[PDB]
Amino acid sequence: RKKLEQLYNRYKDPQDENKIGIDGIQQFCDDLALDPASISVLIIAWKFRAATQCEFSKQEFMDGMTELGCDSIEKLKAQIPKMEQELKEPGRFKDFYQFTFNFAKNPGQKGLDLEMAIAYWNLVLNGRFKFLDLWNKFLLEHHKRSIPKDTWNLLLDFSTMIADDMSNYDEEGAWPVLIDDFVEFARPQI
Numbered sequence: 001r002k003k004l005e006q007l008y009n010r011y012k013d014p015q016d017e018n019k020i021g022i023d024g025i026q027q028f029c030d031d032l033a034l035d036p037a038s039i040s041v042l043i044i045a046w047k048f049r050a051a052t053q054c055e056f057s058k059q060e061f062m063d064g065m066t067e068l069g070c071d072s073i074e075k076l077k078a079q080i081p082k083m084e085q086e087l088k089e090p091g092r093f094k095d096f097y098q099f100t101f102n103f104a105k106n107p108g109q110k111g112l113d114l115e116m117a118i119a120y121w122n123l124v125l126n127g128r129f130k131f132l133d134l135w136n137k138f139l140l141e142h143h144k145r146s147i148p149k150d151t152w153n154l155l156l157d158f159s160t161m162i163a164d165d166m167s168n169y170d171e172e173g174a175w176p177v178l179i180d181d182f183v184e185f186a187r188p189q190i
Helices: 002-009 022-031 039-047 058-067 073-086 090-104 114-124 132-141 149-161 177-189
Strands: none
Touching: 002 058, 039 073, 039 090, 039 114, 090 114, 090 149, 114 132, 132 177, 149 177
């Protein structure tokens, strides 16, 4: 599509035609009337299967718009409520949540920097995870610098299965020692 290529030219980095830079990504979110660091834009990145935050290639832009059947920003803007609704399924939420870890991190680095894991947890789990604030505090206190993928996924498991009063928690080996330690820390504070 020529209408899609013309819309791409509006964003491409002047130095590198095959990528969209900071300015171009900022332009794209503005045209969509969205904050570049908002949950709606993260949902859009998920639908575009974007590899990394603050990076948006010609391949990702072209393939994503084609897959979504969009050749204009208005067509993409209209698809946003459908993208949001798709998350109602727990299978699709787990999909978006796991995508988030890979998108947030640096390519070629195993874990997710804690400061970025907190920011993305606050973006995807705020209002979903009851102990989000205490969890972020616990990890900062135990001077954790990096979050492995296993920790990222185990937190969604904890979040979805834990009672608001933590009465259904079994510390008898079932969960790793990190989560046994978090329950020990959080129980007096609730």
